[PDB]
Amino acid sequence: ITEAALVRDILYVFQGIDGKNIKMNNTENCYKVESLRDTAVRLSELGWLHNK
Amino acid sequence: ITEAALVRDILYVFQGIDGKNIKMNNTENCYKVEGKANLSRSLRDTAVRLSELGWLHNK
Amino acid sequence: LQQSLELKRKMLRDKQNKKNSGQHLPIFPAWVYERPALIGDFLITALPIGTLPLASQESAVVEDLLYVLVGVDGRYVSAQPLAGRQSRTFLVDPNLDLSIRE
Amino acid sequence: LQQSLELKRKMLRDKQNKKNSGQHLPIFPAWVYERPALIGDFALPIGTLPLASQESAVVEDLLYVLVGVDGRYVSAQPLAGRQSRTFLVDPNLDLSIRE
Amino acid sequence: RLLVWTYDPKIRLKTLAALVDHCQGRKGGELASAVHAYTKTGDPYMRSLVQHILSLVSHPVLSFLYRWIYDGELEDTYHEFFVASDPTVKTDRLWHDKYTLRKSMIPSFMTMDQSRKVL
């Protein structure tokens, strides 16, 4: 998938809700992307800290 | 259509004078609205809500 | 809804015999309570496609939800009848997008 | 790595009995290390491109990499003993620009 | 990716997760002495962040200490104050034996002499 979908989904992740390519893992409250995947995982911790 | 028509129309419904998009003015006691833009909350719900103030005025 | 027709008799009676021949309490006329147009709720057009454009979803959903807030109906969302108990249930579209739905 | 928690225990026991002035003293978050981004540090083919596009992809990646995280190509090897952590830059850019 | 925009909330969120997760399962002056555990510090960014939460939690506590420094009384199912009032006492044993000093709900800005003088 493209970086363009991931940047519009990280904004959804910020609200604490699931994006359309980045989806929740149940082993944490942590979002996981379906290289550059680690950079998106770093920003998804904002939505984790929102959830809590 | 436009809402600026609805203000002057519901105005007529208030007075017991014939409306413009609506033709019931306490001749059935139910108000029947004619669709000109097919709005179910901004041509129907609001209009039937405001029509009861005209029914009270008629009374 | 229809249980309320009970109360309006019985709660008068306890007061009625107290006055017993004084200036008793009138009843407010029934048509006031027949109409749903004195209530915010209206109890019961829509275009399902799958809500495919997101940018138009943003423009349309907020108008329909602003209706649903005061008890007027929207298109995609619609308030469904619960006046039998003091609550309200609202119906969403099952084709609504996963982000906008939550 | 792990040793920090042990330090935080041994300091805390040392902090308490000297002065009892504080009440319900705080202990540092374990959840800072659990969540990977509270800490400051953790596509296109990279070999079949020409040199100018190589340098543009490299400038885009290095603008990420100045602060600690894995980039799009270059990552950093694990922490284990390094207090002065460096990165492992990926080649296929020319050996002039490598300096 | 815009990492820069979101590192400044990564610190504010760090401190907020600190105050929320640490103060779990505490109420009363055990919560006005768990959020008054974070102005004992030397991080001036965290002390100011706590001083919009500490002010709110202190106000019911100081409301109860106005009904127990002068006329008034507090009785509810969960006391968030150090008094544990004793219902159904008609005897004269009320000299300290109707109003027990609950040590667990003593907040962090009162010492032993401060929470015992007021009772």
UniProtKB/Swiss-Prot annotation, chain C:
Ubiquitously expressed. It comes from the Eukaryota. It is found in: Cytoplasm, Cytoskeleton, Microtubule organizing center, Centrosome. Component of the gamma-tubulin ring complex (gTuRC) which mediates microtubule nucleation. The gTuRC regulates the minus-end nucleation of alpha-beta tubulin heterodimers that grow into microtubule protafilaments, a critical step in centrosome duplication and spindle formation. Plays a role in neuronal migration. Belongs to the TUBGCP family. It is linked to Cortical dysplasia, complex, with other brain malformations 15: An autosomal recessive disorder characterized by global developmental delay, variably impaired intellectual development, speech delay, facial dysmorphism, microcephaly, and varying degrees of cortical malformations including pachygyria, thin corpus callosum and subcortical band heterotopia. Most patients have generalized seizures. Component of the gamma-tubulin ring complex (gTuRC) consisting of TUBGCP2, TUBGCP3, TUBGCP4, TUBGCP5 and TUBGCP6 and gamma-tubulin TUBG1 or TUBG2. TUBGCP2, TUBGCP3, TUBGCP4, TUBGCP5 and TUBGCP6 assemble in a 5:5:2:1:1 stoichiometry; each is associated with a gamma-tubulin, thereby arranging 14 gamma-tubulins in a helical manner. Gamma-tubulin at the first position is blocked by TUBGCP3 at the last position, allowing 13 protafilaments to grow into a microtubule. This is Gamma-tubulin complex component 2. It comes from Homo sapiens (Human). The chain holds residues 150 to 258 of 902 of the full protein.
Swiss-Prot record, chain D:
Ubiquitously expressed. It is found in: Cytoplasm, Cytoskeleton, Microtubule organizing center, Centrosome. It is linked to Cortical dysplasia, complex, with other brain malformations 15: An autosomal recessive disorder characterized by global developmental delay, variably impaired intellectual development, speech delay, facial dysmorphism, microcephaly, and varying degrees of cortical malformations including pachygyria, thin corpus callosum and subcortical band heterotopia. Most patients have generalized seizures. Belongs to the TUBGCP family. Component of the gamma-tubulin ring complex (gTuRC) consisting of TUBGCP2, TUBGCP3, TUBGCP4, TUBGCP5 and TUBGCP6 and gamma-tubulin TUBG1 or TUBG2. TUBGCP2, TUBGCP3, TUBGCP4, TUBGCP5 and TUBGCP6 assemble in a 5:5:2:1:1 stoichiometry; each is associated with a gamma-tubulin, thereby arranging 14 gamma-tubulins in a helical manner. Gamma-tubulin at the first position is blocked by TUBGCP3 at the last position, allowing 13 protafilaments to grow into a microtubule. Component of the gamma-tubulin ring complex (gTuRC) which mediates microtubule nucleation. The gTuRC regulates the minus-end nucleation of alpha-beta tubulin heterodimers that grow into microtubule protafilaments, a critical step in centrosome duplication and spindle formation. Plays a role in neuronal migration. This is Gamma-tubulin complex component 2. The gene is TUBGCP2. The chain holds residues 150 to 258 of 902 of the full protein.
Curated annotation (Swiss-Prot), chain E:
Component of the gamma-tubulin ring complex (gTuRC) consisting of TUBGCP2, TUBGCP3, TUBGCP4, TUBGCP5 and TUBGCP6 and gamma-tubulin TUBG1 or TUBG2. TUBGCP2, TUBGCP3, TUBGCP4, TUBGCP5 and TUBGCP6 assemble in a 5:5:2:1:1 stoichiometry; each is associated with a gamma-tubulin, thereby arranging 14 gamma-tubulins in a helical manner. Gamma-tubulin at the first position is blocked by TUBGCP3 at the last position, allowing 13 protafilaments to grow into a microtubule. It is found in: Cytoplasm, Cytoskeleton, Microtubule organizing center, Centrosome. This is Gamma-tubulin complex component 3. Ubiquitously expressed. The gene is TUBGCP3. It comes from the Eukaryota. The chain holds residues 366 to 484 of 907 of the full protein. Belongs to the TUBGCP family. It comes from Homo sapiens. Component of the gamma-tubulin ring complex (gTuRC) which mediates microtubule nucleation. The gTuRC regulates the minus-end nucleation of alpha-beta tubulin heterodimers that grow into microtubule protafilaments, a critical step in centrosome duplication and spindle formation.
